[PDB]
Design a protein around this nucleic acid. Structure first.
Ligand SMILES: [Cl-]
Ligand SMILES: [Mg+2]
Ligand SMILES: [Mg+2]
Ligand code: NA
Ligand code: NA
Length: 274
DNA sequence: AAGACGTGGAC
DNA sequence: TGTCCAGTCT
């Protein structure tokens, strides 16, 4: 058999993936890839990252862009709050940080859309600085290798082992190896993350509130100035064309109130504008 | 904490 | 080929 760090390093060399956002120095380009990767497959991110970088090449450029343009670029990646939080982070850094991202984990975690994993990822991948980077692939490796016989294991139990095994001067290459080995394990054995205490599944997407959330934002993006009642008519048309029934008035008004509060579009009179 | 929050790639 | 599943925030 093989000790843990040697299994990871050798597997990482065997499995290395030459992804476009790897081995970059620009923390902003790395941040965009990491936000895009949250709960989203590498192959999808590959279809968006280069295009997004071309349209918004810097923190300052993303800050200056219209929110509608950023949302348009995001459509299809899902979990669209990420687009707003990423743009907000750019706006904060443009106005307060001279157009640059911070270079400590704590300061990165203070920014919208950047939790512990994205913060550690930016520090490791952009700055080659060590930290605890625990996402689905790393979780899978540690569950498979160090918790082989355990039915359910919390991230609390994994955290000290991820911390202890991160090399001081090689974090970027180490976490690429964990990412690549984890994705491999997810293909060749029963997904080890099923033994995570936090393993869950979402509600049915068809007919769901979040399906309507995403449609409503697309309808407003497509039609600046759309009236509030017209928006309801168009949502109902989409639902019926998809085979579902009309949306009840309470649900329509509640979802729209949520989307305005979150910043996807604004109300001007009775009309909506992204 | 648990649970809200998209949707397309792999099999 | 319908099912599984690829972090942040409160
Ligand atoms: Cl729902
Ligand atoms: Mg944050
Ligand atoms: Mg589904
Ligand atoms: Na713009
Ligand atoms: Na598998």
């Amino acid at each position: 058999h093989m000790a843990f760090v040697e299994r990871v390093r050798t597997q990482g060399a065997l499995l290395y993936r030459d992804l476009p956002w790897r081995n970059l120095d620009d923390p902003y380009a790395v941040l965009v890839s990491e936000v895009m990767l949250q709960q989203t497959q590498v192959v999808r991110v590959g279809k968006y990252w280069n295009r997004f970088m071309g349209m918004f090449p810097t923190i300052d450029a993303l800050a200056a862009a219209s929110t509608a343009d950023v949302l348009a670029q995001w459509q299809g990646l899902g979990y669209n709050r990420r687009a707003l939080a990423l743009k907000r982070t750019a706006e904060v850094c443009s106005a307060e940080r001279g157009g640059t991202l911070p270079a400590t984990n704590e300061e990165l975690q203070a920014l919208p859309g950047i939790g512990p994993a994205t913060a550690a990822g930016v520090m490791a991948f952009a700055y080659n600085r060590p930290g605890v980077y625990l996402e689905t692939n790393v979780r899978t490796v540690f569950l498979h290798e160090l918790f082989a016989d355990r039915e359910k294991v919390s991230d609390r139990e994994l955290w000290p082992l991820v911390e202890a095994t991160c090399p001081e001067d090689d974090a970027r290459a180490w976490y690429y190896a964990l990412l690549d080995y984890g994705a491999h394990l997810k293909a060749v054995v029963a997904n080890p993350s099923r033994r995570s205490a936090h393993h869950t599944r979402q509600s049915t997407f068809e007919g769901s509130r979040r399906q309507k959330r995403a449609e409503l934002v697309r309808l407003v993006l497509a039609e600046p100035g759309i009236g509030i009642d017209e928006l309801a008519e168009r949502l109902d048309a989409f639902e019926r064309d998809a085979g579902r029934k009309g949306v009840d008035a309470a649900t329509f008004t509640s979802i729209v109130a949520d989307l305005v509060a979150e910043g996807f579009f604004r109300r001007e009179g009775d009309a909506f504008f992204a």
